[PDB]
Amino acid sequence: GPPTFNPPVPYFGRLTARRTIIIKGYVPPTGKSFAINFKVSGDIALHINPRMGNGTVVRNSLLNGSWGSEEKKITHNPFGPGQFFDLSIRCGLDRFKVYANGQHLFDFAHRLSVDTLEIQGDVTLSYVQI
């Protein structure tokens, strides 16, 4: 499983527990927002949505066109405009564990009972490795 280099945005990659996904990217200086979606079919098990406008990192799940409760709590925000980030997402048995630049960012408990990776919006990708 070699890394994909300079994948285009919007990105659509086809995808298990204890496996970690690497995403290196870049936030454009004029960026407003971007999204990273772990989807089944158009349902989203984990929606990661950094918004540079108010500096939030919004997490949620999408079932039947309906969003669940938002999770927003963080101790740091690695997604400032004009900055590069090194993101890792480990799929655990009961939750996602997401790190940014080696520092834990958040955990996300599985709500959905995930074979697709979607990345769209104001972001440039350096490489994605599964």
Ligand X SMILES: OC[C@H]1O[C@@H](O[C@H]2[C@H](O)[C@@H](O)[C@H](O)O[C@@H]2CO)[C@H](O)[C@@H](O)[C@H]1O
Residue 83 or 120 with smaller CB distance to ligand X: 120
129 near ligand X, rule: CB under 6 A: no
60 near ligand X, rule: CB under 6 A: yes
58 near ligand X, rule: CB under 6 A: yes
Of 12, 13, 26, 49, which lies in the binding site for ligand X, with binding defined by CB under 6 A?
Answer: 49
Maximum alpha-carbon separation in the chain: 37
Burial of 46 (0-12, 13-18, 19+ CB in 10 A): buried
9 near ligand X, rule: CB under 6 A: no
Supply the Cα-derived Rg of the chain in whole angstroms.
Answer: 14
Q: Give the whole-angstrom CA distance, residue 89 versus residue 18.
A: 10
55 near ligand X, rule: CB under 6 A: no
Residue 2 or 65 with smaller CB distance to ligand X: 65
Q: Give the whole-angstrom CA distance, residue 67 versus residue 27.
A: 25
Residue 5 or 67 with smaller CB distance to ligand X: 67
Nearest to 33 by CA among 87, 80, 76, 67: 80
Q: Give the residue ranges of the annotated binding site for a beta-D-galactoside.
A: 67-73
- Interface with ligand X by CB under 6 A: which residues? 47, 49, 58, 60, 67, 70
